[PDB]
Amino acid sequence: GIQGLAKLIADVAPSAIRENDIKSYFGRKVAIDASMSIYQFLIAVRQGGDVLQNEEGETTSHLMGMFYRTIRMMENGIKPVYVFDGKVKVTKQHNDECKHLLSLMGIPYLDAPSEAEASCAALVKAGKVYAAATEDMACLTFGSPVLMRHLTASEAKKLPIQEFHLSRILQELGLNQEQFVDLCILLGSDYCESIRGIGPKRAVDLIQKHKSIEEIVRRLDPNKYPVPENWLHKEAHQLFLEPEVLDPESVELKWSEPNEEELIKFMCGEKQFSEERIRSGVKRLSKSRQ
DNA sequence: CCTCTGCCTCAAGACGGG
DNA sequence: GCCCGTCC
DNA sequence: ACTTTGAGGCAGAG
Ligand SMILES: [K+]
């Protein structure tokens, strides 16, 4: 994520956030970070202090969450493509099992060379999907034209679906993508440190005036705002600006009919899900394809 | 105003019966 | 609708 | 990660 970026946009560029009804997204395609969704299911889907599992002790919380959340999206007319991270722990077995489930459900997935969010952003840039459905605002820093929050949130949570439009953010802040990347570094990114004493108000002001972190460092008073030693801001800038990403043209994205017979063998025979519940889910999925 | 830091509170997936 | 036990 | 974890809201110092 980017520390304080969503709050900043709401505070200073609220017109960049559009809130629309779920019905308005019927038929839209979205990219989703599979690795993060697996991680979240391992945390959320718990019983008695442990993940759901079959009698052999093999985890199934990830399968449970992926199976029903995907069906709910398709019931809303939203077609997801899942993006797996490239180069509580998400294991290779978790990924392989979720990929197997997705293939049997007829849901496309892709392997990112590196960051899943950056490859999600690349898919939106190429027009392959409408938006990245994520809470990670760094997807904007990777250049995603549209980010959508709370798309999969249950109705009970009463969280409105929010579209963040990158072009509007840049227009309101008066910045280009390169300057926006430097601003996100000053706000606080996973890749490198931020300058102590420089928060969201001063970072926006300094980026608008000086236009680059390099220029900012020269202008700043070293005594008042010392930078961290061996600051990797040039490296982080490059990771956001030119990330290693998949080729959106490489793989054709297709949503196909689920394979109920194989889903029963895998989810019920092996993973010991209730057959009644799996068949009910498959029927909802088939109905949503209409 | 602005940015910390420390203290605090509470959500964290989906389903289905009542 | 919500509450809350259960899912595996 | 619910016999825990962590993100965010708040108040006040500097
Ligand atoms: K800082």
Nucleotides of chain C within 7 Å of a protein C-beta? Answer: 1-2, 6-8
Pairing of strands A162-165, A17-19: antiparallel
How far apart are alpha carbons A12 and A15 in whole angstroms? Answer: 9
Both tokens of residue A192?
A: 């490198």
Give whole-number Cα distances, A260 to A69, A71, A100, A244, in Å: 17, 14, 13, 36
Asked if residue A164 lies in contact with residue A183, where contact means CB atoms within 8 angstroms, the answer is no
Tokens of A223: 């005594």
Tokens found for residue A158 = 């009463």
Closest nt to A197 (CA→C1')?
A: B3
Sign of CA dihedral A170, A174, A176, A179: negative
Phi (first) and psi of residue A3, to 5 degrees: -65, 120
Helix (H) or strand (E) holding A30: strand A29-33
Q: How far is the CA of A149 from the C1' of D10 (A)?
A: 25
Residues by CB within 7 A of strand C: list them.
A 45-47, 52-54, 60, 64, 155-156, 158, 271-274, 277
Q: What technique solved it?
A: X-ray
Nucleotide nearest to A50 (CA to C1'): D1
A36 vs A138: CA distance, rounded Å: 14
Query: What's the gap in Å between A197 CA and the centre of ligand 1?
Result: 5
Residues whose CB is under 5 A from ligand 1 (ion)?
A: A 194
Query: Helices marked H in A108-163 — which ranges?
Result: 116-125, 138-141
- Do A75 and A282 contact (CB within 8 A), yes or no? no
- The resolution, in Å, is 2.0
- Give the 3-state secondary structure of residue A17: strand
Q: Do A133 and A80 contact (CB within 8 A), yes or no?
A: yes
- Among all strands, which nt has the closest C1' to A59 (CA)? C8
C-alpha–C-alpha distance, residues A222 and A214, integer Å: 13
Helix (H, G, I), strand (E, B) or coil at A210: helix
Residue A7, CB, less than 7 Å from strand D? Answer: yes
Query: At a CB cut-off of 8 Å and minimum separation 6, what does A197 contact?
Result: A224, A225
Q: Do residues A67 and A280 touch, judged by C-beta distance below 8 A?
A: no
Nucleotide D4 C1' to residue A88 CA (A): 12
A196 touches strand D (CB under 7 A): no
What is the rounded CA–CA span in Å between residue A156 and residue A107? 26
- First-last CA distance in chain A: 37
A265 touches strand D (CB under 7 A): no
The residues with which A59 forms a beta bridge, in sequence order, are A53
Q: How many domains does chain A have?
A: 1
* Residues 6+ positions from A71 with CB-CB distance below 8 Å: A281, A284, A285, A288
The sheet that has A162-165: what strands, in order across it? A17-19, A162-165, A146-149, A131-133, A29-33, A79-84, A109-111
Q: How many angstroms separate the alpha carbon of residue A185 from the centre of ligand 1?
A: 9
CA dist A279 → A4, A135, A267, A276 (Å) = 43, 31, 10, 5
Instruction: Tell me, in angstroms, the distance from the centre of ligand 1 to residue A173's CA.
Output: 19
Amino acid symbol at A40: Q
List the A99 CA – B16 C1' distance (angstroms). Answer: 28
Exposed / middle / buried, residue A86 (Cβ in 10 Å: 0-12, 13-18, 19+): middle
Sort strands A79-84 and A146-149 into parallel, antiparallel or unpaired. unpaired
**What backbone torsions phi and psi does residue A31 show, to the nearest 5 degrees?**
-100, 140
Residue A43 beta carbon within 7 A of nucleic strand D: yes
Find and give the residue nearest to D14, measured CA to C1'.
A197
**Residue A244 belongs to domain spanning:** 1-290
Query: Is-contact A103 A83, C-beta < 8 A?
Result: no
**CB atoms closer than 10 angstroms to residue A233:** 24
Q: Which nucleotide is nearest to A43 (CA to C1')?
A: D1
